[PDB]
Amino acid sequence: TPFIRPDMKAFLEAIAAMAGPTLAEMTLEEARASYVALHGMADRPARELAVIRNLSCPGPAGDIPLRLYDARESREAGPVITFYHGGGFVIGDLDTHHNLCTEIAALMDLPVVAVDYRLAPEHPFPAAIEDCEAATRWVASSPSELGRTASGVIPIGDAAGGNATIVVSQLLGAKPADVPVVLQVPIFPLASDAVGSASLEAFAEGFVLTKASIEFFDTAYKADRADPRGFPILGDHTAAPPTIVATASLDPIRDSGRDYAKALVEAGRDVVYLEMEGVTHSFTNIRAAVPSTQGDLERIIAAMKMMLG
Ligand SMILES: O=[N+]([O-])c1ccc(O)cc1
Ligand SMILES: O=[N+]([O-])c1ccc(O)cc1
Ligand SMILES: O=[N+]([O-])c1ccc(O)cc1
Ligand SMILES: CCCCCC(=O)O
Ligand SMILES: CCCCCC(=O)O
């Protein structure tokens, strides 16, 4: 009987009523479409912004599509947020997380560049990481196509995107971009392997992200358990940038985020650890279906402003 907010519980009851196929039982196109449909009906609508612009940058496999969000048509040099969507490195795209990106841009009053990285199974590990790193370095170089100079970058992302956040920050720590990572915001990230964790057993079914979906994602992505680009808990934390780790109390991978924040404290790094009570994985993208999660996102925003000083 873990604590669940009433609005969260109602959403979980509707998902249970829907029932229907697992990700693995669908075709890939169907699986991706169902995620579009879920966030389409569950999230608050897009904020209006001065700038919402599609562009691209070079990557190791070809061009990487990007989307720029900015509440300001013109702005001075400052930190730029570099966002990586979740979806197990298999599903999700620029549209599944579009509304959340507009919200981050609106509430932070900073530019946001979302990365349309290559997906598994067609592009297995480390394709997503390669693209997220390359796009983040490109933004950090203040290209003229972007139209706003970066004094630093802020990697942020949910779930798989929170995994990518941590990996990108480690890769740029080892080999700096043109400006530093000034803050990283992994939201319900995968840092340590969730297999064997207490949270995975406790929340394996009925809490939006399922153990079955995790296994489907594992099989598609094929990240080696010994590779720190797959499981960044294995990385060097001694120079980790300022960090905000946000988890959900009902998340099967909650303990992975607990592990990562503990590792940062162990290494003497500054970290804000926020564990949202009574909500699930995906809370950043279900802000209309579960209205209390808007407040959870706003707490992350407040922590970001504080850590940026
Ligand atoms: O990856 N996820 O966050 C998911 C995946 C499938 C789903 O039905 C809900 C959430
Ligand atoms: O999409 N996810 O959050 C995942 C995917 C795979 C995994 O092993 C753990 C978490
Ligand atoms: O979604 N993820 O973050 C993942 C997915 C697969 C994996 O092996 C490791 C992490
Ligand atoms: C929009 C998601 C596609 C990114 C490139 C890929 O399919 O692998
Ligand atoms: C093991 C999952 C139940 C959550 C109990 C805790 O907060 O540690």
Author numbering: 4 to 312
Quote what the paper states about this structure.
To advance the understanding of esterases, we have identified and characterized E53, an alkalophilic esterase from a marine bacterium Erythrobacter longus. The catalytic reaction relies on the S-H-D/E catalytic triad located in the catalytic domain.
The catalytic triad was composed of S162, D254, and H284. We have prepared S162A, D254A and H284A variants and mutating the three residues to alanine (S162A, D254A, H284A) resulted in almost total loss of activity. The distances among the catalytic triad in WT and mutated E53 were 2.6–2.9 Å for H284Nε2 to S162Oγ and 2.5–2.6Å for H284Nδ1 to D254Oδ2.
